[PDB]
């Protein structure tokens, strides 16, 4: 007849990432709506930059001053007008200031806490006015990418190598390199409109069984699909 | 005929762990893919570690010329031994600081210890990690050469070892015999391996011996934890 | 925001378990007086004084 392998498996986020502060300070602003969608590099919080701005302004000012003096003493020591010691001191101060600009520049950059990935942000563990710390145990927020979404399918090792063969023999239709065109039956019984992809590289092998988990990727442009849903994937042979 | 049952095992396994504290900026592998020994799997944010390293190097530049200089000066008695000893102490401290800052910066690139297939990441981006933490971030298993692992009574083994010796048994190499492999679904592996008669473990209670066969696995057909049969004559 | 949301949540949770722990302890202490369930005629005591119950 028609050859049908329906496959049990769970939805999973494509990518998950935490949002953490990397400088100490007060949360001046949140900038995002809880539950909403966010883009990689999107600013999610503003940490109070006043002290960071001023450390940076000051580090630049020390560099300028100190750099000019070492230029000046470079010439002076040339005409034996100063001793090596005074030039040494003048250069030491300069090298030190040059190095100090970097950390101040870095800290200032960290006052804008950016989304590490594009996706769906949850609740904020933190409140405007609250002090955060670099290295603090809890994340301020979590972003989950959902637009491509994963469907984790486990199977016996024979079953998988069976399927793999069917793709090489063309018995089975390709959806790209090392992948099969695949369809999705939801939790109830209805169909997914969009159609996916079953990649045949194993992601894990169970210790007790020889059981293998592979993944499917489906488009999900409206979050019809969310993590945790128990679905069934369809193959045509 | 002769069909010794087996279980497939990875040829080599490794854990991926952070050796410096910081936050995961990037995961650089696809879960399930092949990676090489030395390949970068994660990026710990290195901005500060890079800044510390460059401060340290700057500081070492100053304290080092100062120390080389005071060395000449004490020789001229233009400076005391205390002054020179202090310049030399500050130098030595700078050198130590450079070395340690280098090491930390180097560890911001979490590498794969071996070539093999990598699984899932136990850790997401934006997670904090710690040198010496309990949990591995990922595991890598070399699958291509794959092991089979046959546990047999010790009579079996010494029977087999004289058969190779006489010739009743096709020779792969020294201490090794040509073998073939039958999958859990009766199918027949195209490739053929070696049954290596160098003993790997001997069971405690039962006197039974585990030996391993090695099969090529260049397509990734075989995975660990398969029930199979090796095949001799 | 003189403390964090997490700190307040922690102090709130500590208070709740501790509220529960006092209730358990109050009950336990109340039950050291073993009371008659119904009015009536009581037989032999199947347990001696100094028994472990």
UniProtKB/Swiss-Prot annotation, chain A:
Instruction: Give the gene name.
Output: mexA
Q: Disruption effect?
A: Disruption of MexA, MexB and OprM significantly reduces active efflux of N-(3-oxododecanoyl) homoserine lactone/3-oxo-C12-HSL/PAI-1, but not N-butyryl homoserine lactone/C4-HSL/PAI-2.
This protein's assembly is summarised as: Component of the MexAB-OprM multidrug efflux complex, composed of six MexA subunits forming a hexameric tube, binding to a MexB trimer, which interact with the trimeric OprM outer membrane channel protein. OprM is thought to not directly contact MexB; instead, MexA joins MexB and OprM by forming a funnel-like hexamer anchored to the inner membrane. MexA may initially form a hexameric ring complex with MexB prior to OprM, then OprM undergoes a conformational change as it contacts MexA, allowing the periplasmic gate to open.
The record's function comment reads: The periplasmic linker component of the MexAB-OprM efflux system that confers multidrug resistance. Functions as the major efflux pump for n-hexane and p-xylene efflux. Has been shown in one study to be involved in the active efflux of the autoinducer N-(3-oxododecanoyl) homoserine lactone, thereby playing an indirect role in quorum-sensing; but has been shown in another study not to be involved in efflux of this autoinducer. Over-expression of the pump increases antibiotic and solvent efflux capacities. Implicated in the secretion of the siderophore pyoverdine.
User: What name does the UniProt record give this protein?
Assistant: Multidrug resistance protein MexA
Any other noteworthy remark? In both X-ray crystal structures approximately the last 100 residues are not ordered.
Q: What is the effect of changing residue 83 to D?
A: Abolishes complex formation and thereby decreases drug resistance
CC terms in the record's Gene Ontology section: efflux pump complex; plasma membrane
Q: Which residues of the full protein are shown?
A: 48 to 284 of 383
The induction text for this entry reads:
By growth under severe iron limitation.
Q: Cellular location of this protein?
A: Cell inner membrane
Q: Which species is the source of this protein?
A: Pseudomonas aeruginosa (strain ATCC 15692 / DSM 22644 / CIP 104116 / JCM 14847 / LMG 12228 / 1C / PRS 101 / PAO1)
Q: How is its activity regulated?
A: Export of antibiotics and solvents is dramatically decreased in the presence of the protonophore carbonyl cyanide m-chlorophenylhydrazone (CCCP), therefore may be driven by a proton gradient. Antibiotic efflux is inhibited by pyridopyrimidine derivatives, such as ABI-PP, acting by binding to a hydrophobic pocket in MexB.
Q: What are the protein's UniProt keywords?
A: Antibiotic resistance, Cell inner membrane, Cell membrane, Coiled coil, Lipoprotein, Membrane, Palmitate, Signal, Transport
GO aspect biological process, one term: protein homooligomerization
Could you tell me one molecular function GO term of this UniProt entry?
A: efflux transmembrane transporter activity
Q: Does the keyword Membrane apply?
A: yes
């Amino acid at each position: 007849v028609t050859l049908n392998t329906e496959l049990p498996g769970r939805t999973n986020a494509f990518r998950i990432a935490e949002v953490r502060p990397q400088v100490n300070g007060i949360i001046l602003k949140r900038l995002f709506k809880e539950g909403s969608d966010v883009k990689a590099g999107q600013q999610l919080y503003q940490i109070d930059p006043a002290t960071y701005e001023a450390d940076y302004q000051s580090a630049q000012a020390n560099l300028a001053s100190t750099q000019e003096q070492a230029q000046r003493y470079k010439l002076l020591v040339a005409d034996q007008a100063v001793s090596k010691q005074q030039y040494a001191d003048a250069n030491a101060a300069y090298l030190q200031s040059k190095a100090a600009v970097e950390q101040a520049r870095i800290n200032l950059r960290y006052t804008k806490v950016l989304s590490p990935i594009s996706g769906r942000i949850g609740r904020s563990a933190v409140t405007e006015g609250a002090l955060v710390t670099n290295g603090q145990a809890n994340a301020m927020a979590t972003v989950q990418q959902l637009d491509p979404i994963y469907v984790d399918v486990t199977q016996p090792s024979t079953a998988l190598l069976r399927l793999r063969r069917e793709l090489a023999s063309g018995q089975l239709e390709r959806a790209g390199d090392n992948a099969a065109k695949v369809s999705l039956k939801l939790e109830d019984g209805s169909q997914y409109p969009l159609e996916g992809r079953l990649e045949f590289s194993e992601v894990s092998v169970d210790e007790g069984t020889g059981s293998v988990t592979i993944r499917a990727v489906f488009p999900n442009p409206n979050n019809e699909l969310l993590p945790g849903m128990f679905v069934h994937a369809q193959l045509q042979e």
